[PDB]
RNA sequence: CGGUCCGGCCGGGAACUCAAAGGAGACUGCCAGUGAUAAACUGGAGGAAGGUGGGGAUGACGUCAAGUCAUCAUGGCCCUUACGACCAGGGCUACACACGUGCUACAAUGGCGCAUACAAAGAGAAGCGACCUCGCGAGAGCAAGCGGACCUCAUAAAGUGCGUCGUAGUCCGGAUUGGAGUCUGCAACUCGACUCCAUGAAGUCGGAAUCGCUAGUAAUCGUGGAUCAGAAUGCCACGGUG
């Protein structure tokens, strides 16, 4: 049976597909270090996955757009989470309860002008 | 190959003056497409606010235009030839090229 | 005048889920680079079993802990002229305090290799010599003294 | 207001277009030469370069509404002073003053 | 092995007593050196007989040290007498590299300290 | 899913980013604790998430015996054998003395050299200028695409990596003084850019004393544009790390 999922974080959207069977884990159609290798925070996807166990019995397949290698790991997070809550029913209940349906939605600060600085003033005191 | 553009300053004029090109465009017609509304081209401005001092902030800015390309299916002279020689679409501007 | 402010609770580790190690990065952090504090992180603990590490079940949190603030101090007034007092520390500060008393005191002095001097330091942190202990008997010495008339 | 700054432009700026915009092809033929350690030319490089009341340097284009030669916008044909005060009395198309 | 100064330290790098000599230094060096196809990889000081007296004779195809150094102090030597300020400038002690004077010409009276 | 300059490239799909109009969602509304069985807060619950939702545009009166006639008018004073204007040069880059703001190195947890990942947002038909070059290189030479979701500015830099350098107060920092140049303009003395080969210096985050921010904020490194003979450390947006 065919489980999918999305998710959005810090400027990136992420699309997730899982099938029962043992497999590997692709995206973009290559492995998670031939870009990704550089970063050292990357297995938060991992962190909804370690309830059906890193890819003994399932097949995990991962596209994401746009965005940095911290962003993208927070909505390929998302998209598993989104995913994992149909493979089981008991999933259902725990994927709420660890908290990773939460979004996190902020990425900038708005104008309000001047402010050279755009939030620092310049130095009060001192003469 | 005869093409059109609908330009405006504001995202409901421009939607309101599309559905008459798309009533124009089946008044003797039945074949439309799609109007796609496209990314906002936008140009931003930053200079002093007042005839009078203000030297530690200028004032800011930002012209949003609004663009749709509409497509007419079947460009008959029953359909756009009076509409090339006179337009007749306020608030907005259509712009007929070859 | 009430500060107090909001609730940041912050991310734990992506490799064993710590809270420790997911703050002690953000104290190694400088010019907000995280990448030269990840090359000091597990080297130090590494690098101390090639001297002294026995058992790791904590990784560093009882070097931590062996490591002790108590001289912390505020200022009181009703007026001009101030009034000093010392202060009883929550575990969170006593903890935030007594990591960055290690990691200064094996900047002390310029070296090679960063989880080296820190390892140095670790190797001491059984018995606490010089650094991170001789400034605070010398001015605890007015811990009472500063308690007198409240 | 010094009018004399206006009647530097309309004999620069409003006179350089068909004389000055392109021009340096009437110098260059002076480095056009068969061969190298020989001349043809001499001095006739101080004929060539001989006008002083027009020029490709010396052009300002200034404010067309108030003679300015600072803060003026070539997309309005205004100044910073005049963008708001056509704005304000709405007399200038697709410019709005807040509030996106 | 060598072609000037008197001394190298063993096979650390062979640019050392052939770089800062005067219109060679840390470019020309290694381009010299690549004459005899002594390199920055797998350093030696062994070079093979024949091999030495025609490198020697590509550091004399120009002037070395102290008689080219004579160059960099001569623009201040060739104008001095005319009272422009090249010349007075070149005749007295006084700024020549556009730096505000308002304001920290104090430093021309001396240090500092 | 069919064909393939093997290229989302072309058919084609409409799922999925995204670009975008429209509905749903949040009212202190529910419950506890305090407290005029008050009003209102604090805590809990739901959900992607509240508690001026997070944020913009925000400016009630009256303002100091306050600034601006150099943005524009205008009462008065005064000049016109000029406090004009048309030119050639100067001054605005005098320092005899009095105060500050930046930015870069002061390092090692770092630099230097040489490869490599990622954009975001502008600007572009006498313009942005690819490709390939001639040469040590600035530059010069030829010339395509492009009216810009269809080309160009433009291999983002921090970061990821491999060699290499090391406490010597730095053969680091490369200012500065020369040599060889390349261009712009009537013309580069002072007082113009940009390039190649030499040159060689102060400097261990500081002394009385003293700043800004509670979050994409403080801290830190790159990108773009307007102004445009040739040249901003000037003036404003955009993004990574955080």
Redesign the interface.
């Known amino acids: 049976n065919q489980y999918y999922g999305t998710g959005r974080r810090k400027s990136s959207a992420a699309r997730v597909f899982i099938k029962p069977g043992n497999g590997k884990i692709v995206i973009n159609q290559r492995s998670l270090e031939q870009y990704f290798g550089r970063e050292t925070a990357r297995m938060v996807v991992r962190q909804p996955l370690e309830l059906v166990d890193m890819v003994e019995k399932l097949d995990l397949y991962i596209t994401v757009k746009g965005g940095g290698i911290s962003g993208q790991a927070g909505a390929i997070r998302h998209g598993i989470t989104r995913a994992l809550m149909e493979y089981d029913e008991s999933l259902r209940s725990e994927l709420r309860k660890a908290g990773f349906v939460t979004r996190d939605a902020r990425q900038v600060e708005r104008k309000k002008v001047g402010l050279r600085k755009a939030r620092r003033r310049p130095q009060f005191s001192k003469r | 190959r005869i093409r059109i553009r609908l330009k405006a300053f504001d995202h409901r004029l421009i939607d309101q003056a599309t559905a008459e090109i798309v009533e124009t465009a089946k008044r003797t017609g039945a074949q439309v497409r799609g109007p796609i509304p496209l990314p906002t081209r936008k140009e931003r401005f930053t200079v002093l606010i007042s005839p009078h001092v203000n030297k530690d902030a200028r004032d800011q800015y930002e012209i949003r235009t609004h663009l749709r390309l509409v497509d007419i299916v079947e460009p008959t002279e029953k359909t756009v030839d009076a509409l090339m020689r006179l337009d007749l679409a306020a608030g907005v501007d259509v712009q007929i090229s070859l | 005048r009430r500060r107090v402010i909001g609730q940041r609770k912050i991310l734990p580790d992506?490799?064993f889920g710590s809270e420790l190690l997911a703050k002690f990065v953000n104290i190694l952090m400088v010019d907000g680079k995280k990448?030269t504090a990840?090359s000091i992180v597990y080297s130090a603990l590494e690098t101390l079993a090639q001297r002294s590490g026995k058992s790791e079940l904590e990784a560093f949190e009882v070097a931590l802990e062996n490591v002790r603030p108590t001289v912390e101090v505020k200022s009181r007034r009703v007026g001009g002229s101030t009034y000093q007092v010392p202060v009883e520390v929550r575990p969170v500060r006593r903890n935030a305090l007594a990591m960055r008393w290690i990691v200064e005191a094996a900047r002390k002095r310029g070296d090679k290799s960063m989880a080296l001097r820190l390892a140095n330091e670790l190797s001491d942190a059984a018995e606490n010599k010089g650094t991170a202990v001789k400034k605070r008997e010398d001015v605890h010495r007015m811990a009472e003294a500063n308690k007198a008339f409240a | 207001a010094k009018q004399s700054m206006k009647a530097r432009e309309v004999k620069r700026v409003a006179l350089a277009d068909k004389y000055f915009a392109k021009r340096a092809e009437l110098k260059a033929i002076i480095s056009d030469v068969n061969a190298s350690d020989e001349d043809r030319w001499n001095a006739v490089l101080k004929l060539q370069t001989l006008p002083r009341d027009s020029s490709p340097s010396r052009q300002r284009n200034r404010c067309r509404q108030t003679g300015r030669p600072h803060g003026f916008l070539r997309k309005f044909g205004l100044s910073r002073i005049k963008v708001r005060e056509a704005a304000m009395r709405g007399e200038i198309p697709g410019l709005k003053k807040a509030s996106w | 092995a060598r072609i000037a100064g008197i001394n190298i330290p063993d096979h650390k790098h062979a640019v050392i007593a052939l770089t800062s000599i005067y219109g060679v230094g840390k470019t020309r060096s290694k381009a010299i050196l690549a004459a005899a196809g002594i390199a920055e990889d797998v350093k030696i000081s062994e070079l093979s007989e024949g091999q030495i007296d025609t490198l020697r004779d590509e550091v004399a195809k120009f002037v070395v040290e102290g008689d080219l150094r004579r160059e960099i102090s001569m623009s201040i030597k060739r104008l001095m007498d005319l009272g422009c300020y090249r010349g007075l400038r070149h005749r007295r002690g006084l700024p020549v590299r556009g730096q505000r004077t308002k304001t920290n010409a104090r430093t021309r009276k001396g240090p500092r300290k």
């Open positions: 992506p490799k990448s990840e």
